[PDB]
Design a protein around this ligand. Structure first.
Ligand SMILES: *[C@@H]1O[C@H](CO)[C@@H](O)[C@H](O)[C@H]1NC(C)=O
Ligand SMILES: CCOc1ccc(CC(=O)O)cc1
Length: 338
């Protein structure tokens, strides 16, 4: 079980002004720290944030959070469920800012909601340093769905924060799961552009300097922000991700067949120069915190093994790190989730 800690700095808040926080399970004999970012879409104006507050309140407020949570998947402490990092210090950071972890704005006389996702990550890191993170050798910032995109937007800022605070021996790395999207044509980007203005969203500095004022929405797309990052980042992405197909208005005749096959080919192309990646040919929305995350394989290698091979590489015969399916249709890989 991971135990809840609300942030001691109560000015760093969820959407409705309640304190943000994190769930923690310490492993006293470990210098590995895993900080995981939850996902769950976003909201981008008054009316649709009000709608989310009615039926998705836990993603906007800590008032109803439980005192504990169970770690599952890569957050499990059981070796059978988590062959990769079962002995690590485990942190789950709830998503309660509705801003793809990019916001830096407080509730105020002019703002009905606070959007503080970028500051929540920084404040969690700050408070963990006094709980043992100061002795870490590796900090892995991981996340799924909107949290996977949040990894790409925040991993270098965490590295810069620890360097400026005087901790240069901590190696910061990123694991982005199901957060690598294409700004493609629909079968039948504006919402992000509007969100950035509503949230006062921030993007990595090198990416900001390339795209410049008014075009920062580009940095929310993995294949554009990834080449600007300096920290090592491992990318996990289904070739036929269900959230991608949703925004593409896909829910099979020749036209749709070609559309789906072209989506998988384009995704594969964007991963050609991503040396650490795991990209199975499955239609799915499930994520690396599910109990059975060990079951999928690409070319005979599981994701826990690929992540172990990545670890070795950052110090290989039969220990690959670049695993992208080449077959062109969902479930052409027999190990796809059922
Ligand atoms: C609390 O967090 C805010 C936002 O990052 C910061 O400006 C402020 O200085 C913090 N307060 C303390 C006491 O650290
Ligand atoms: C482009 C980044 O924005 C998003 C990323 C992922 C999701 C999917 C989810 O959170 O379940 C939704 C939005």
């Amino acid at each position: 079980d991971l135990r809840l800690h609300l942030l001691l700095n109560t000015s760093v808040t969820c959407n409705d002004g309640s304190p943000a926080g994190y769930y923690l399970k310490e492993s006293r004999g470990s210098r590995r720290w895993l900080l995981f970012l939850e996902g769950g879409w976003y909201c981008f104006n008054r009316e649709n944030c009000d709608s989310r507050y009615d039926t998705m309140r836990r993603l906007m407020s800590s008032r109803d959070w439980p005192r504990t949570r169970t770690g599952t998947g890569i957050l499990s402490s059981q070796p059978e469920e988590n062959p990769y990092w079962w002995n690590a210090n485990m942190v789950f950071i709830p998503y309660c800012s509705s801003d793809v972890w990019s916001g830096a704005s407080s509730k105020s006389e002019k703002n009905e909601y606070a959007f503080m996702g970028a500051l929540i990550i920084q404040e969690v890191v700050r408070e963990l340093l006094g709980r043992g993170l100061s002795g870490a050798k590796v900090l892995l910032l991981a996340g799924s769905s909107a949290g996977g995109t949040g990894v790409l937007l925040n991993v270098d800022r965490v590295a810069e924060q620890l360097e400026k605070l005087g901790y240069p021996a901590i190696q910061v790395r990123g694991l982005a799961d199901s957060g690598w999207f294409l700004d493609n044509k629909q079968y039948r980007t504006e919402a992000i552009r509007r969100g950035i203005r509503y949230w006062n969203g921030v993007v990595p500095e090198r990416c900001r300097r390339q795209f410049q004022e008014g075009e920062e929405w580009n940095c929310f797309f993995g294949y554009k922000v990834y080449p600007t990052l300096r920290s090592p980042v491992f990318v996990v992405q289904w070739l036929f991700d269900e959230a991608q197909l949703t925004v593409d208005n896909v829910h099979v005749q020749e036209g749709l067949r070609l559309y789906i096959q072209n989506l998988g080919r384009e995704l594969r192309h964007t991963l050609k120069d991503v040396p650490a990646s795991f990209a199975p040919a499955c239609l799915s929305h499930e994520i690396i915190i599910r109990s059975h995350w060990t079951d999928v394989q690409v070319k005979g290698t599981s994701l826990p093994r690929a992540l172990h091979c990545w670890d070795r590489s950052l110090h290989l015969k039969g220990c690959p790190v670049h695993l992208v399916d080449s077959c062109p249709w969902p479930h052409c890989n027999p190990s796809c989730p059922t």
